[PDB]
Symmetry: D2
Subunit: 268 residues, 4 copies
C-alpha cells in the first residue's frame, strides 16, 4: 500500500521542520519506509525536530567534511538497521556556501577558501556519501540529491550556482559507480521552497538591489509554472524524491528530475 | 495498493504485444487503473492483442489524422466510462513517418508531403489529443507522450528525429493549456525497445551502411547506460509512464523524463 | 581587408530595409562579398529595397514551397555568378506561420494545414535550399539559417516555436550532408529585432493579454542580457552571420550561435 | 587586413609548442594583435617556446593560485603595454587536476584537497583573472576561456569534468560582471587536441581499461563530426578563439562556442 513499503532509507539534511529533508522523511515514513537520519552539528536541536516526524528514527551524526564520520558511517548505519540488513535508499539534502559566496556580497569578492568549502559540502559530499554507503546498499537501490537548476546565471545565488553545476556533474559520475551495485543516482531540481536556507538568502538581501531581483524570481516562478508554484509547500518536492526512491523510475540514472511546477520549461 | 488505483486512463498506440502501449496498459491495469484503449486502422487485429491484457477494456477507433474521430472522441470515451465520470490520464504512444523519411532513404529525398504526414501523426497529434480530451479530464490528471531523444542527429532516424524535436516543443505548449485544467503534460524519452516500429527501421536497413550504424547504436546504449539497457524489455519504460500518470511527480510538467538506462547522461 | 573578400554568397529573405537579411547582405557587401539575392512573391517591391544596398546584386525569385523554383535554382544562380564559379555561402533568412498559429489565436485552434505550411517554409526549406545549393558550393563553404531559441515555451510565438524546434533538428541533419562537400551548416539564434515579422506579432497582439506578455519579453531581454539588447539594431546579428560565413569558425557545424546579448545564459 | 589589427591581448597557458595557447597566440599575432603572455612556474622553459612565436612578446609570471601574482597582475601588464593603454582581450587557457582526480585513478578515491586544487586552477581562476584584468580592459573587449564539453560523463576525465562544469557556470557569472565594462566573456569548447595535457591523460591510461575507452573516444570524434576532426591540428580551435576576440561576435556573452567539428551535435 505504501510506495516505499519495506525499504530502508537514509535521509540527511534535516535542520528545521521546514527542511526539504524533513518533508522527504515524513512522506517516506507515511509511505512505509524505515529511516535512518543524519544531522550536522546541532544534534540536540535536530532531535527536537525529528521528534515531530510520524515515527521514531535513529539520528546519526554526519559532518560531510569530517573524514572520520564518513569512514565510520556505514558501520554506524549497519548498527542502527541491524547486521545483515542494507539500505535501499540514500537522500543527500545538504548544502552550504559561506556568506561571501551568496547574497549581496559581490561575486568576485568570494575568496577561494570560502568557495572551496561550499563546493566540498554542496557537491563533493554527494560523491563521498555514495562512496561510504554504496557498500551497504541493496541492488535496486536509489541515491537522490537535491539540486537547483544552475543552467543559467541569476542574481544572488552566485557561487552556490557554481556548486550546483558541479553537483550535476558529480551525479553523472556517481551513477557510473552506483550502477556497479544495481543502484540509481539522480537529482531532484526543486523550485524555491521557504526553508532556513532560502530564508537566509532572501533575508540577507532585504533592502538591497539583490532583494529586488529575488522578489522578481519569486514572483516569476509561479507565473511561468503552467501548474503554479507554492513556495510554502515542500510536499510536491518530497513526493518526487520518494518517486525516485521507489521502483517506479527504474531506468532513470545520472539524471535530473525537475520538481519546479514546470517553470524551467517556460521562458515566461 | 496499486499506484493507479481508481484512475481512468486512455491508452493509444497498441498495435502488437510488443507495443510500448501494450506494456503501459498492462502495468497500469496491474496497478489498479480502469482503461479505455484507442487503435488505428487494424482494429480487428488490435482486439486480438488487447484480449491478452490482464483485463477487458473497450477499444475505440482513433486515427489522429481524422478530424471526425477527434471531434467525436470525448463523447465516445464518456460513453465508455459512464456519464459523470472523467479521465485522470491520457497516453499518447503514437508515431509514423513514411518510409522516405526514415531508414536508408537519403535525408534530402523525403518530399515535404511525406514529412508533413509524419509530423502530423507524431507531433501535432499530441496537441490535438490534448485538445479533444482535456475537457473530460479531472484536475490532478496527467497526459504522457512517448519521445526518443532528438537533441542530436543520428543515422537512419532522419525525419522522425525532426518530428520528435517538434513533439518536445508541442509538449511544452500543451502543458500551458493543460495547467488550466489542473493537468500535467510530459514525455517519456525511452531507450530503444524492439517493437514493430523499431524492427521496421532496423529491418529496412539490414545489409546497408545505415544498418552497420544502427548496430553501433544498439551496442552503445547498454554500454553507456550505467545500469544497462535491455532492448527486449518495455517494462521499465511502462513503469516510468505509470509514475507520471500517478500522483508521485506532482510538480513536473512540460518536461521530459528519460527512461533510457541513463544513456543520454553519458558520452560513453 | 574584408572578412568575406572574394566570397560569393546567396542571401534569401529580404522583404524590407529592416529585414535581418537586408543587414546581413549590407554587412557582407561591406566586407567584400559578391551577393546573389532571392526574394519571394513581391519582387518589384523587394527590388526597391535591394536598390538601397551598398552594391547591385541580382535578385532571383525563390518561393521555397515551389518545387520548380527549387529545381531551377542552382542553374539560375550559376547563370548569375558565371559558369565555372560556385557559391561559398548560403543564408536562409526565411520564416512564415499562418496567423492561426501565432499571436493571440489559441494554440489548440491552429489547424494542421496551417501548421504544416509554417513548418514547410520555416523548417523544411532549410533542407530543401541546402539540397538545391550544395551541388554548387565550394569546399570551405558555409550555410547559415536564422533561429529564435525554442528550448522553452513562451507567449504568442506558439507554433512558430514548434517550427524553430524542427529547424534546429533539421540543421543537425543538413550538417551531415553538407560535410560531404566540405561545407558547414549552422543557425544564428537572434534576440528580438523590430522587423516586419516581429512587428506583425507584436502589433497583432496589441491591446490583448498576449500583448502584455510580449511587453514583458521585450523588457526582460535587455535586462537579462549582460551586455544589453537593442531591438532596433540588426547589425550585431548580421555581423554574427558574417562570422559564420567567414573562415573564422572553421570547426563549428550542426550548431547554434546565439546573437542575443547573452540573454539565454541568464535566468534573470 | 588582420582580424585583430590594433588589439592588445593577454594570453595565458603556453607551456609547449603544442599548447592551444601557443596556437591562439600565433594566429592572433598573424592577425595583427599585440600580445602580453603569462606563464606558470617553468618560465625559462616557456621562454624557449615563446621565442618560436611569430613576434616577440613579453612573458609575465602568473600562478593563478598565487594571490600576490593576481594582485600585481594589472600593474605588470600596464607596465608592459604602456601607461594609458588597456587590453582588448584576455585568454584563459589554463587547467590542472592532480593525477588522483583524472585517468585510471578511481573517481571516489580523489581526496577533496586534490579536487579543490583542480577546481581552483581550472574554474575559479577564470573569475579571478577577470577580476584582476577587467579594470584594465577597454569597452568592446573580450575574455575567452577554454572548455571541454562536460554535459555528459565519460571515462577518465573524471574530476576535470566536474571542474569544467563549474567553469561553464563561472563564465555565466563573469559575463554579468564583464558586461559592466562593455566586455564579453565566453568559452570555446574544443574537441580533443594532442597537447601535453591530453598526452598526459592518454599516456597515463595506456595499457589499462580506461585507455581502451579513450581509444574509443578518439576514434568516435572524427567519425561523429560531420566535417571531421584532426587531433593534431589546434589551428581551428585557435581561429575560433580569435573570432570571439574579434568584433565579429558582438552579441554573444556568457556563452559557449563549440570548436569540435560539430561532434557534440551528433549522437553518432
Ligand atoms: N529550499 C529551496 O528552495 C531549494 C531549492 C532547490 C534545491 N534545494 C536544495 O535542497 C537541499 C536542502 O536544503 P533546504 O532548502 O532544505 O535547507 P535547510 O537549511 O533546511 O537544509 C540544509 C542542510 O544542509 C546541512 N549541512 C550543511 N553543512 C553540512 C555539513 N558539513 N555536513 C552535513 N550536512 C550539512 C544542514 O545541517 C541542513 O540540514 C540543498 O541541497 C539545497 O541546495 C533547496
Ligand atoms: N520502441 C522504441 O525503441 C521507442 C523509443 C522511444 C520512443 N518510442 C515512441 O514510442 C511510441 C510508440 O511506438 P512503439 O515503439 O511502441 O511502436 P508500435 O509500432 O508498437 O506503435 C506505433 C503506434 O502508432 C500508431 N499510429 C500510427 N499512425 C496512427 C494514426 N494515424 N492514428 C493513431 N495511431 C497511429 C500505430 O497504430 C501503432 O499502434 C512512439 O511515439 C515511438 O516513437 C519508441
Ligand atoms: N526579427 C527577430 O526578432 C528574429 C529573431 C530570431 C530569428 N529571426 C528569424 O530571422 C529570419 C528572418 O526574419 P525577419 O525578422 O528578418 O523578418 P522579415 O519579415 O524581414 O523576413 C521574413 C522573410 O521570409 C520570407 N518568406 C516567407 N515565405 C517565403 C517563401 N514561401 N519563400 C521564400 N521566402 C519566404 C519573406 O519573403 C521575408 O523576406 C526568420 O527565420 C525569423 O524567424 C527573427
Ligand atoms: N587539448 C585538448 O584536447 C583540450 C580540449 C578542450 C579544452 N582544452 C582546455 O584547453 C586549455 C589549455 O590546455 P592544453 O590542452 O593547451 O594544455 P597545455 O598542457 O598545453 O596547457 C595547460 C596550461 O595550464 C597551465 N597552468 C596549470 N596550472 C597553472 C597555474 N597554477 N597557474 C597558471 N597556469 C597554470 C600550464 O602552465 C599550461 O600552460 C585547458 O583549459 C584545457 O582544459 C583542451
Ligand atoms: C537566490 C535566489 C533565491 C531562490 C534560491 C532557491 C534556493 C533556496 C534554498 C536552497 O538551498 C540552500 C541550502 C543551503 C545553502 O547554503 C547555505 C544556507 C544558509 C547559509 C549559508 O551560508 N549557506 C544555500 C541554499 C537552494 O539551493 C536554492
Ligand atoms: C534509427 C535508430 C534505431 C533506434 C530507434 C529507436 C526508436 C524505435 C522505435 C520508435 O518508434 C517509432 C514509432 C513509429 C515510427 O513510425 C513508423 C513505424 C513503422 C513504419 C513507418 O513508416 N513509420 C517510427 C518509430 C522510435 O521513435 C525510436
Ligand atoms: C512572440 C514573442 C515576440 C518576439 C519574437 C521574436 C521574433 C521576431 C520575429 C521573428 O521572425 C519571424 C519571421 C517570420 C514569421 O512568420 C510570419 C511573419 C509575418 C506574418 C506571418 O503570418 N508569419 C514569424 C517570425 C522570429 O522568428 C522571432
Ligand atoms: C579523457 C578523455 C581524453 C580527451 C580529453 C580532452 C582533453 C584534453 C586535454 C585537456 O586539457 C587539460 C589541461 C590541463 C589538465 O590538467 C592536467 C594536465 C596534466 C597533468 C595534470 O595533472 N593535470 C587536464 C586537461 C582537456 O581539458 C580535455
Ligand atoms: Cl548538539
Ligand atoms: Cl552517531
Ligand atoms: Cl566517527
Ligand atoms: Cl507562495
Ligand atoms: Cl503535492
Ligand atoms: Cl479492422
Ligand atoms: Cl469507436
Ligand atoms: Cl467519428
Ligand atoms: Cl538486448
Ligand atoms: Cl523494471
Ligand atoms: Cl512583383
Ligand atoms: Cl529569377
Ligand atoms: Cl523556375
Ligand atoms: Cl529597444
Ligand atoms: Cl555590433
Ligand atoms: Cl624558471
Ligand atoms: Cl613578471
Ligand atoms: Cl607579484
Ligand atoms: Cl588524428
Ligand atoms: Cl582551420
Ligand atoms: Na503559472
Ligand atoms: Na553500461
Ligand atoms: Na542587461
Ligand atoms: Na565524420
Amino acid at each position: 500500500t505504501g510506495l516505499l513499503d519495506g525499504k530502508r532509507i537514509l535521509v540527511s539534511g534535516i535542520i528545521t521542520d521546514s527542511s526539504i529533508a524533513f518533508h522527504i522523511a515524513r512522506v517516506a515514513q507515511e509511505q512505509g519506509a524505515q529511516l535512518v537520519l543524519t544531522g550536522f552539528d546541532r544534534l540536540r536541536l535536530i532531535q527536537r525536530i525529528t521528534d515531530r516526524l510520524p515515527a521514531k528514527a535513529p539520528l546519526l551524526e554526519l559532518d560531510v567534511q569530517n573524514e572520520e564520520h564518513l569512514a565510520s558511517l556505514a558501520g554506524r548505519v549497519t548498527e542502527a538497521i541491524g547486521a545483515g540488513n542494507k539500505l535501499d535508499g540514500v537522500v543527500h539534502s545538504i548544502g552550504f556556501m559561506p556568506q561571501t559566496g551568496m547574497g549581496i556580497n559581490p561575486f568576485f569578492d568570494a575568496p577561494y577558501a570560502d568557495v572551496s568549502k561550499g563546493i566540498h559540502i554542496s557537491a563533493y559530499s554527494y560523491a563521498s556519501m555514495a562512496k561510504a554507503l554504496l557498500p551497504i546498499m541493496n541492488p535496486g537501490g536509489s541515491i537522490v540529491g537535491m539540486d537547483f537548476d544552475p543552467s543559467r546565471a541569476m542574481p544572488a545565488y552566485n557561487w552556490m550556482t557554481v556548486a550546483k553545476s558541479a553537483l550535476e556533474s558529480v551525479n553523472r559520475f556517481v551513477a557510473r559507480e552506483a550502477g556497479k551495485y544495481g543502484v540509481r543516482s539522480n537529482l531532484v531540481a526543486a523550485g524555491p521552497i521557504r526553508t532556513l536556507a532560502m530564508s537566509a538568502i532572501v533575508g540577507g538581501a532585504l533592502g538591497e538591489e539583490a532583494g529586488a531581483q529575488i522578489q522578481l524570481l519569486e514572483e516569476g516562478w509561479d507565473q511561468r509554472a503552467p501548474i503554479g508554484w507554492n513556495m510554502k509547500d515542500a510536499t510536491p518536492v518530497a513526493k518526487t524524491v520518494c518517486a525516485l526512491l521507489s521502483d517506479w523510475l527504474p531506468a532513470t540514472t545520472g539524471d535530473i528530475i525537475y520538481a519546479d511546477g514546470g517553470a524551467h520549461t517556460q521562458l515566461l
